[PDB]
Design a protein around this ligand. Structure first.
Ligand SMILES: CCC(CC)n1c(Cc2cccs2)nc2cc(C(=O)N[C@H](CC(=O)O)CC(C)C)ccc21
Ligand SMILES: CCCCCCCC/C=C\CCCCCCCC(=O)O
Ligand SMILES: CCCCCCCC/C=C\CCCCCCCC(=O)O
Length: 381
């Protein structure tokens, strides 16, 4: 009685939200993944009224064996396709941070592959799903029959075999790829920011310093950070007109640090602090804006943020489903008490709601991070 309501709520939110996303993308490099996610999320929730009616009828499937096989199959392919599309979107956001449109062709290929690979991994569910009176309650259930692939003493090896494969490909491998993407990109972004943090932190140190040696020490660390940010090539590729302007901006800053460094060496603390404060002028403020703009700093921070929200929304939504399926896999295999077997069984339909929550949450995360979808939806509003 509780679960059917949630299944209905996610059905409306899922098809209206992801329906609005497809309307927009059909009215960039990572835009293949967006439209694939919209159509995977859309097929994922589309047969839920069948399972909402099934759960309401105290687990009694009235729609026959073909709708039991087809409904489960469409859900299971959407299940993998949307995970693989989230992982492909997280990998495309990773490349937009490291590398500098051939990706428009490549993304289409990647999406095509994961769409076939998903429709093939979901094939065992299309095969073993069947309807019959399981555990004799007089109501027919839509269950996965492992008896058509093994004897009584072997149904576990199939249940575990397919179950472990489902979690490995549907959770462990994509989360391992999305975490690797985060760890590499976060490192790269935290390289540019480290040099700019060092510059600002040490300027505060010069302002409050009490002697020339303290001012000299902070200037030395600022000078090494300025040259460190000059060596890191921005997202532009020899001695081109635009390339010289980047290095000249840094040369002004390094020169001003050297000017204060020579005053510090002569023991002129007040004059060195005043010389250091030249970096705060409007002239040097636009040099900072030009150089931080040339590096694509705020634009790469937004890109890293996109990865984190994908990784986390996914880890939070799918962990309960994958933890309880893996725990139940072991409860039946290495036998656990019926107190714990029956717990995992009854908490499992709640795990499918929190996992479904990912599908209808996505249209809002696109609306958050992409102001082009915000402007495409607000024009139609
Ligand atoms: C296709 C139907 C949907 C439900 C709408 N469904 C999904 C995909 C999703 C739909 C919505 C969110 S996830 N996965 C499922 C996994 C099982 C399952 O493994 N049951 C185990 C016994 C067995 O092996 O048959 C026992 C539990 C206690 C572990 C059952 C239904 C599953
Ligand atoms: C098993 C499947 C798990 C891995 C799934 C997807 C990884 C996709 C990474 C490649 C995306 C290509 C992006 C691009 O080149 O534009
Ligand atoms: C050519 C066929 C492809 C080979 C498949 C190998 C990978 C199998 C992995 C997942 C298949 C789905 C298994 C689902 C686990 C049981 C969940 C359920 O009760 O529906």
């Amino acid at each position: 009685a509780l679960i059917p309501a949630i299944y209905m709520l996610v059905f409306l939110l899922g098809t209206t939200g992801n329906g609005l996303v497809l309307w927009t993308v059909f009215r960039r490099s990572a835009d293949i993944f967006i439209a694939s996610l919209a159509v995977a999320d859309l097929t994922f929730v589309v047969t839920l009224p069948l399972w909402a009616v099934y759960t309401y009828r105290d687990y009694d499937w009235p729609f026959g064996t073909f709708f039991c096989k087809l409904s489960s199959y469409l859900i299971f392919v959407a299940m993998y396709a949307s995970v693989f599309c989230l992982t492909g979107l997280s990998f495309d956001r990773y490349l937009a941070i490291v590398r500098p449109l051939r990706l428009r062709v490549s993304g289409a290929v990647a999406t095509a592959v994961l769409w076939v690979l998903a429709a093939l991994l979901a094939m065992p569910v299309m095969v073993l799903r069947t309807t019959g009176d399981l555990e004799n309650t007089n109501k027919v259930q839509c269950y996965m029959d492992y008896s058509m692939v093994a004897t009584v003493s072997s149904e576990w090896a199939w249940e575990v075999g397919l179950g472990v494969s489902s979690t490995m490909v549907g959770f462990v491998v994509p989360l391992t790829i999305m975490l690797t993407c985060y760890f590499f990109a976060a490192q790269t972004i935290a390289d540019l920011e480290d040099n700019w943090e060092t510059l600002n932190d040490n300027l505060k140190v010069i302002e409050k310093a009490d002697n020339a040696a303290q001012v000299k020490d902070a200037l030395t660390k600022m000078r090494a950070a300025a040259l460190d940010a000059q060596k890191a090539t921005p997202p532009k590729l020899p001695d081109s007109p635009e390339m010289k302007d980047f290095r000249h901006g840094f040369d002004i800053l390094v020169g001003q640090i050297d000017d204060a460094l020579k005053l510090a060496n002569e023991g002129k603390v007040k004059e060195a602090q005043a010389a250091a404060e030249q970096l705060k002028t409007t002239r040097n403020a636009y040099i900072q804006k030009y150089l931080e703009r040339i590096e694509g700093l705020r634009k790469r921070r937004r890109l890293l943020s996109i990865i984190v929200v994908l990784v986390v929304t996914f880890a939070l939504c799918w962990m309960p489903y994958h933890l309880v399926k893996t725990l139940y896999m072991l409860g039946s295999l290495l036998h656990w008490p019926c107190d714990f077997d029956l717990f995992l069984m009854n908490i499992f339909p709640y795990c499918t709601c929190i996992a479904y929550v990912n599908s209808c949450l996505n249209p809002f995360l696109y609306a958050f991070f992409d102001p082009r979808f915000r402007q495409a939806c607000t024009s139609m509003l």
